[PDB]
Amino acid sequence: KLXXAHXXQEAX
Amino acid sequence: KLXXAHXXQEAX
């Protein structure tokens, strides 16, 4: 839904 | 930053 969260970078 | 995005579920 979140589009990848900037290739995983915004997971944190 | 996004707190886990609901344990990975909101990645999409």
Method for structure elucidation: X-ray
Are residues A7 and B11 in contact, defined by beta-carbon separation less than 8 angstroms? no
Contact check, Cβ <8 Å, A12/B5: no
Q: Tell me the C-alpha to C-alpha distance, in Å, between residue A10 and each of A1, A4, B4, B8, B12.
A: 13, 9, 9, 11, 13
Q: Say if CB A2 and CB B2 are below 8 A apart.
A: yes
Q: What Å resolution does this PDB entry report?
A: 1.1
Cβ of A2: how many Cβ atoms within 10 Å?
Answer: 14
C-alpha B1/C-alpha B10 separation (Å) is 13
User: One-letter amino acid identity for A1?
Assistant: K
* Separation of alpha carbons A8 and A10, rounded Å: 6
The tokens describing A7, both together, are: 């290739």
Cross-chain Cβ contact B5/A4 below 8 Å: no
CB of B7 within 8 Å of a chain A CB? The answer is no
